[PDB]
Every structure is written in structure tokens, then in C-alpha cells.
């Protein structure tokens, strides 16, 4: 701590009680970080320490589905997306089995009809 007292604005700056009274008044007025954090509604360490996930705690509260991008049906939790949920070093062996039907399954016209053809031949 550091303390400085100016007494030149007093009638008798030479009095002995002034310094002690001022120091004790300042200590009374001083508030603790625990009290400040409790009154604000947040943890005490987030007001003193430089840890990068503390940036999230100064912003207000927002819906998870509102923050993260929506899906095909609209708002969905980011935790319900398999890619969001799974590490990248696991989706090569069994993920491929699971999603083979996703890419390589469909109707006969879906699987045997080439879409890579002229689409204006008839009008020409």
C-alpha cells in the first residue's frame, strides 16, 4: 500500500490526531475485492488476474443458440453438432462408416443419374 496526507487545508496542520484519523478514515472507506465482486455479482479473481477466459465474464449473458450459428431447422445448441462435439483426430475411421450413407446412399435415380451434363441442349 501507499498513503499520502495533505493537511495544509486544515486550521491546525500541526495537530497530532489528524494523520491517524485520516489514515483510519481512508481504511474505513476502502473496500475489498471480495466485497466488490460479491456486490457486482461475479468472482473476485476475475477482477485482479489476467486469464484469457475472463473476457467472457465481462460481457452479458446471451443464449448459446443465439451466439452460435443456427442449423438447418433454426436455432440449435452448438453441442448437438457432431463436428462441433468431436475432436478432429477421431473422425477418419468410424465417422466415415457412419456418414457413408450420408454421401453414398440414395434412390436409383439419385445414384445412377449423372448431373454433370448439358442443361440447355433442348432449348438450343
Amino acid at each position: 500500500a501507499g498513503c499520502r496526507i495533505n493537511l495544509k487545508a486544515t486550521n491546525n496542520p500541526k495537530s497530532p490526531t489528524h494523520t491517524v484519523e485520516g489514515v483510519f478514515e481512508a481504511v474505513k472507506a476502502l473496500r475489498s475485492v471480495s466485497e466488490i465482486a460479491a456486490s457486482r455479482g461475479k468472482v473476485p479473481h476475475s477482477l485482479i488476474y489476467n486469464i484469457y477466459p475472463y473476457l467472457e465474464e465481462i460481457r452479458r449473458r446471451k443464449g448459446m443458440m443465439a451466439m452460435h450459428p443456427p442449423g438447418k431447422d433454426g436455432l440449435l445448441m452448438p453441442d448437438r453438432v457432431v463436428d462441433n462435439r468431436l475432436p478432429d483426430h477421431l473422425k477418419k475411421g468410424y465417422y466415415d462408416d457412419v456418414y457413408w450413407k450420408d454421401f453414398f446412399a440414395g434412390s436409383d435415380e439419385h445414384l445412377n443419374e449423372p448431373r454433370m451434363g448439358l442443361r440447355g441442349d433442348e432449348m438450343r
Partner: peptide, 11 residues
Amino acid sequence: LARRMSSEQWP
């Protein structure tokens, strides 16, 4: 196997 294949629409 044939029933499963028809269900899963494999080529």
C-alpha cells in the same frame, strides 16, 4: 443382407 441393403439404399 438383401433386406438390409434395400433398407439402406446402397448401390
